Design a protein around this ligand. Structure first.
Ligand SMILES: [Zn+2]
Ligand SMILES: [Zn+2]
Ligand SMILES: [Zn+2]
Ligand SMILES: [Zn+2]
Lengths: 186, 396, 585, 187
RNA sequence: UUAAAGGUUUAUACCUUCCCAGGUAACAAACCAACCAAC
């Protein structure tokens, strides 16, 4: 608290007192130099008091104001923050089965139900084209989630059953493309 | 009169170690008011009294837990520790013992009310807490019995229940003894007079109940909080069948609570210098501080780590906005420092460092985002262990 | 928490008296509050006295006490004013630039959008201020729509004719095509929409999109919608290139689109391009030849109204493969032979208000005349494109501005693209008119096209003009000139073939009386844009600025393929008309 | 604190004090001057400490009776809400079938649990699986509580209608299975 | 170095008591708000 007029007044009072002490003038004369000095801080220790309270008061209000802003906007972007955090954790996990499925989902292949873990239950996987069929389906076997699934059914989009060997490179542009492959776990 | 009420059933949302959907009871306001005006003065005396068997209302901080343990060890001749846990305390308590608990709480009204007033208060209690109607999923069902956790007097009623089960276990044990092999003439006279007072006396005998209470207080010392209990007992009397062991207690629960207790819910301890194995999910370590040995409570570090890793609200995922959560966690996990294993103290050091890290992050964000500083000097104490050493040190 | 609309400094203070509540930095918000009546500033919590039962909301009269805000009477002993040191206290106080002059922002935030100067300032202020003014104007229009009373069906006289009772204490909106109502049907505890309607003087004649047997109880309200805030500029900064970027021109093109090929190359040579196509010049032909010139290009055709997008789709059916085109329809009958709600195809046709967030190789925005800066900002926000082609005509009709009462809006103030086209000139110009006879083309070219529009056809000798004031009568919201209708009657009796013509007038009541007496189909000039007819009969019906507008008169007289007869009240445009003058019988 | 009657006392005291100080007559005459202002600065102390501590208690009294009025208004609000809720819920009583039963009581007192068992005009059953469904609500009508009930509506956990033909043994695993079935008392 | 004591008011200085407003520190009590732990 240096940039206040009372600081200048206190400095003048202290200079006068220092001169009186170094001079040793009288006993009432220097008393007048402290009858008007300790009061000069009585209006200096106070006008530097409520403003000193105010600086930290503005601080300890504006800080919770920031905290309110962060609280109110943090809960407004949860739907994206959680999913980004999920995918970062997924990619950090580094598991072959999950990576295979996430790549299949990103390009062409998503299932139609929960993938079962028993060696008896059924799975339906959509294949959008023949390129993904090349990578995934090789004959009667279907590789998916680091597992083998025997093919027993594949149907085009308009619900017409199509046999296995019918599909190849050049006769492929003759079927409804979002194919649904039914398979059973090995 | 009688005023039937409806208590709502609520699905709790909190962390737990087993996939069980624990629920709670939102009891209505009439019961809350007209039970408050009665058990408020009944119970504020209990909650503020130190050195009694009921320990509720006393903090473990500032050496409280050590005082509790010393009280439990009050002049036990051959001391051993024993603990139990009822399988389903709240949903299997038979109706009679609930009535008994309400009655022994209402006993303190020998002056302020007439007998009919006492009877009608008890009637309202059993009408809105014992066999009332509960609304579960927009439908009304009748509660066959049990107790409704959510009233004003659940913990103390369970304390009364625990005391009753312990004492009846002791009596059943002592009257199951042969009585000819028993060596102490005083104890044999005690047995004979106890039988006479039970099955041959139509009135109360103050003298004998005082003597028997003195007997148990001398040889069978309990410390009770809700449904959890810690007892110090004489080995010789237990071996000779003079006081209740785990077997008698199990038998008593079997024939008077319609439930079988297993060993996973009960523990024994032959070394009293280790403290009880578990109490309110708090373990005990005997350690050294200030030229004195005291017992300090330490929790499961798994619980503390789970609290750190997972939270309740989405805003709770940011440590910066809320540092005091880590502060209180640090007080609670501080006694892990004295544990011989390194990882338990390592959890506490982790928390101290991460509190410091979040304070630094908060300062950085605020200064970059608002070019003013308020980091102060008191905050530095939050990552210093003395703040946590004084919390458990007995001067407050 | 936001950015100053005048400084872009991060600040979480928004003016509470402003309808759009723009973020304002400490210095800027201080200047705005001290210079205008806007004394409310809003933050994450509102800067209002926390006293129980107090009404003080002037930030200049408030103090930060404890952790709340109080007036002088209710303040605790320790506080400081929020409005001091030439700034209003708030978050992000140190990071603040301030503005030397806030006069434009003050004028925009305080104007009532009834003067031409307001729109001129809005189209000439800063881009951030352009967005702010567009938001303010659109919100003001939406609010003003709410001030009108509800019209309720009291009696069903017949089909397509109704009897409406109006709410007391509220004004009645004009009964023309520019005010589209929506019907609500009485139910037990709520209301259900029954679709959109338009109304005209009968009793009242109602034109509904879908026909019903509506009864007493149904009422009609002008539906309003939320005005979303704008972030994207009306125009992305211009980038000029030395080679065609992002586009691969086809090596084989037909003569039908050959005349545009060079212009198509210019489309690939600059970031955004502006096209001026006069009536009958092939604007949609240009837009579709751009696609055929770059067969692999990803193109978003967009427009404000459904009709322009439907016209683009109709052209696409003619030249573009149907499998590669899809029409986006929000959940009004429109184009329904392209696949609906498909985004990842090659060619997507959609309105501005329903444009999805996507990228494209070319974005073609047709009929720039009706566009507003709000539409430009929305298009720039939703569509990320390598090239933008703005097709339209500043010499044609703009979007109607209902609140404007004082002054006339010039073509250079219609929007940013129109401003560029009227100041620096269009990037491309379609100088050959294939629709109108040579007389009409010469007249419009001398009027608004700077003698740059050329006529493909020869003079048809069927373009006639007559100077006849007649008698002007006024209804609640329109004007009628019955003597002009009588003159048209005499002309029709003496020229029966002209009974194949279509009557066009700037007034809806004039159209109603003309349909009742003549029997010819009737069109307002505003609704006639984008259409074409062989023979046109136009009556000015007044000498007001609405009827004498150069763009409106150009649009009205460019609707004729062969012949047009103009019964004109204004001497100026009548002399400007290069038609064969006829004498009054 | 300037409109107080003593502000004139400071005005005159300080004016005279500074006037005679600039005059500089003598200390003997300035003693009374320096004492008049000395007691004047106490007069303010008294009659100002008597006031500036009063607006605090007045303000807090204002706030108190304000919140007391607010609470009293909420009291009337909840009174109205409770009374209208009771009168709206009573209108459903179906005030005929209950009267026959209550007139049959020896004193008018009947156990509450039988009021919905004998007077309620609607029944809803929640079924966990098809097996128990066969034993209770098979067919288009069934019996319970010495009464005949007729089915009208069947929904699943997702509150969507389910047709009676859809509930078979083989089709069951395709349905959410807290099934809700409502029936009406037949007469 | 200069009779004594007593006498009055005033001025000065010291000390003491009380009152009064200013500030600092401490203590406690209440209210309010957030958060944690236990059953
Ligand atoms: Zn009593
Ligand atoms: Zn600014
Ligand atoms: Zn404003
Ligand atoms: Zn106020």
């Amino acid at each position: 608290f240096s940039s206040l007029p009372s600081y200048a007044a206190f400095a003048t009072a202290q200079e006068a007192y220092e001169q009186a002490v170094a001079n040793g003038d009288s006993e009432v004369v220097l008393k007048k130099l402290k009858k008007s000095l300790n009061v000069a801080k009585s209006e200096f220790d106070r006008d530097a008091a409520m403003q000193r309270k105010l600086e930290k008061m503005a601080d300890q209000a504006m800080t919770q104001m920031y905290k309110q802003a962060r609280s109110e906007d943090k809960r407004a972007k949860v739907t994206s923050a959680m999913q980004t955090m999920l995918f970062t954790m997924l990619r950090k996990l580094d598991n072959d089965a999950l990576n295979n499925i996430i790549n299949n989902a990103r390009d062409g292949c998503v299932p139609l139900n929960i993938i079962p873990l028993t060696t008896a239950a059924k799975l339906m996987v959509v294949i959008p084209d023949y390129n993904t069929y090349k990578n995934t389906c090789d004959g009667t076997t279907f590789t998916y989630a680091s597992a083998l699934w025997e093919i027993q059914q594949v149907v085009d989009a308009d619900s017409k059953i199509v046999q296995l060997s019918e599909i190849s490179m050049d006769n492929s542009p003759n079927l409804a493309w979002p194919l649904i492959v039914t398979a059973l776990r090995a | 009169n009688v005023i039937p009420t409806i208590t709502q059933m609520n699905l709790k949302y909190a962390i737990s170690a087993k996939n069980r959907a624990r629920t709670v009871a939102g009891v209505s306001i009439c019961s809350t008011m007209t039970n408050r005006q009665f058990h408020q003065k009944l119970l504020k005396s209990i909650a503020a009294t130190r050195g009694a068997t009921v320990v509720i209302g006393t903090s473990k901080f500032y050496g409280g837990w050590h005082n509790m343990l010393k009280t439990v060890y009050s002049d036990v001749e051959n001391p051993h520790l024993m603990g139990w846990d009822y399988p389903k305390c709240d949903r299997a308590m038979p109706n009679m013992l609930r009535i008994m608990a309400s009655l022994v709480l209402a006993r303190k009204h020998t002056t302020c009310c007439s007998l009919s007033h006492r009877f009608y208060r008890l009637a309202n209690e059993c009408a809105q807490v014992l066999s009332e109607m509960v609304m579960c999923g927009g439908s009304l069902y009748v509660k066959p019995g049990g107790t409704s956790s959510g009233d004003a007097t659940t913990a103390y009623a369970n304390s009364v229940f625990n005391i009753c089960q312990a004492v009846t276990a002791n009596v059943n044990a002592l009257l199951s003894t042969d009585g000819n092999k028993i060596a102490d003439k005083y104890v044999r006279n005690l047995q004979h007079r106890l039988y006479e007072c039970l099955y041959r006396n139509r009135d109360v005998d103050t003298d004998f109940v005082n003597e028997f209470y003195a007997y148990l207080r001398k040889h069978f010392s309990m410390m009770i909080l809700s449904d959890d209990a810690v007892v110090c007992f004489n080995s010789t009397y237990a071996s000779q069948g003079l006081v209740a062991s785990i077997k008698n207690f199990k038998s008593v629960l079997y024939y008077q609570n319609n439930v079988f207790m297993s060993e996973a819910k009960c523990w024994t301890e032959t070394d009293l210098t280790k403290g009880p194995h578990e109490f309110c999910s708090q373990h005990t370590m005997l350690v050294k501080q200030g030229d004195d040995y005291v017992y300090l409570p330490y929790p499961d570090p798994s619980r503390i780590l789970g609290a750190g890793c997972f939270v309740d609200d989405i805003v709770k995922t940011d440590g910066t906005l809320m540092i005091e959560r880590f502060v209180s966690l640090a007080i609670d996990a501080y006694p892990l420092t004295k544990h011989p294993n390194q990882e338990y103290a390592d959890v506490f050091h982790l928390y101290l460092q991460y509190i410091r890290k979040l304070h630094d992050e908060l300062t950085g964000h605020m200064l970059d985002m608002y070019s003013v500083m308020l980091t102060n000097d008191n905050t530095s104490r939050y990552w210093e262990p003395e703040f946590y050493e004084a919390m458990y040190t007995p001067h407050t | 928490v936001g950015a100053c609309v005048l400084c872009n400094s991060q600040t979480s203070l928004r003016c509470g008296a402003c309808i759009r509540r723009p973020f304002l930095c400490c210095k800027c918000c201080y200047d705005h509050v001290i210079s205008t009546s806007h004394k409310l500033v809003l933050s994450v919590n509102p800067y209002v006295c926390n006293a129980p039962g107090c009404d003080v909301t002037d930030v200049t009269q408030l103090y930060l006490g404890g952790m709340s805000y109080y007036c002088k009477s209710h303040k605790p002993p320790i506080s400081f004013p929020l409005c001091a040191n030439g700034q209003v206290f708030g978050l992000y106080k140190n990071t603040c630039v301030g503005s030397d002059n806030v006069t434009d922002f003050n004028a925009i935030a305080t104007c009532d959008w009834t003067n031409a100067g307001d729109y001129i300032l809005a189209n000439t202020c800063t881009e951030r201020l352009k967005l702010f003014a567009a938001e303010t104007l659109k919100a003001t229009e939406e609010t003003f729509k709410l001030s009108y009373g509800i019209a309720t069906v009291r009696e069903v006289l017949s089909d397509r004719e109704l009897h409406l009772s109006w709410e007391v204490g509220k004004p009645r909106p004009p009964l023309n095509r520019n005010y589209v109502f929506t019907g609500y049907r009485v139910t037990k505890n709520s209301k259900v929409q029954i679709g959109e309607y338009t109304f005209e003087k009968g009793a009242v004649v109602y034109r509904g999109t879908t026909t019903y047997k509506l009864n007493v109880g149904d009422y009609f309200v002008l539906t309003s919608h939320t005005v979303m805030p704008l972030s994207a500029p009306t125009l992305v900064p211009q980038e000029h290139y030395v080679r065609i970027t992002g586009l691969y021109p086809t090596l084989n093109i037909s003569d039908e689109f050959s005349s545009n090929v060079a212009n198509y190359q210019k489309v690939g040579m600059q970031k955004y391009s502006t096209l001026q196509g006069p009536p009958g010049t092939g604007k949609s032909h240009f837009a579709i030849g751009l696609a055929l010139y770059y067969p692999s290009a990803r193109i978003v055709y967009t427009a404000c109204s459904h009709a322009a997008v439907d016209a683009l789709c109709e052209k696409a059916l003619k030249y573009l493969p149907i499998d590669k085109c899809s029409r986006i329809i929000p959940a009004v009958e429109c184009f329904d032979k392209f696949k609906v709600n498909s985004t990842l195809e090659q060619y997507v046709f959609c309105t501005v208000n329903a444009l999805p967030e996507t990228t494209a190789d070319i974005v073609v925005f047709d009929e720039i005349s009706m566009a507003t800066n709000y539409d430009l900002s929305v298009v720039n926000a939703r569509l990320r494109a390598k090239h933008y082609v703005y097709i339209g005509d500043p010499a044609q009709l703009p979007a109607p501005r209902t609140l404007l009462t004082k002054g006339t809006l010039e073509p250079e103030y219609f929007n940013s693209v129109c401003r560029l086209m009227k100041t620096i000139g269009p990037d491309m110009f379609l100088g050959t008119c294939r629709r109108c006879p040579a007389e009409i083309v010469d007249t419009v070219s001398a009027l608004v096209y700077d003698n740059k529009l050329k006529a493909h056809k020869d003079k048809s000798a069927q373009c006639f003009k007559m100077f006849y004031k007649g008698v002007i009568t006024h209804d609640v919201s329109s004007a009628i000139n019955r003597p002009q209708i009588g003159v048209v009657r005499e002309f029709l009796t003496r020229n029966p073939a002209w009974r194949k013509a279509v009557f066009i007038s700037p007034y809806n009541s004039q159209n109603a009386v003309a349909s009742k007496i003549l029997g010819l189909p009737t069109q307002t000039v505003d609704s006639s844009q984008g259409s074409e007819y062989d023979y046109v009969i136009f009556t000015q019906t007044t000498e007001t600025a609405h009827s004498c507008n150069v763009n409106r008169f150009n649009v009205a007289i460019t609707r004729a393929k062969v012949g047009i007869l103009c019964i004109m009240s204004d001497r100026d445009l009548y002399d400007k008309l290069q038609f064969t003058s006829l004498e009054i019988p």
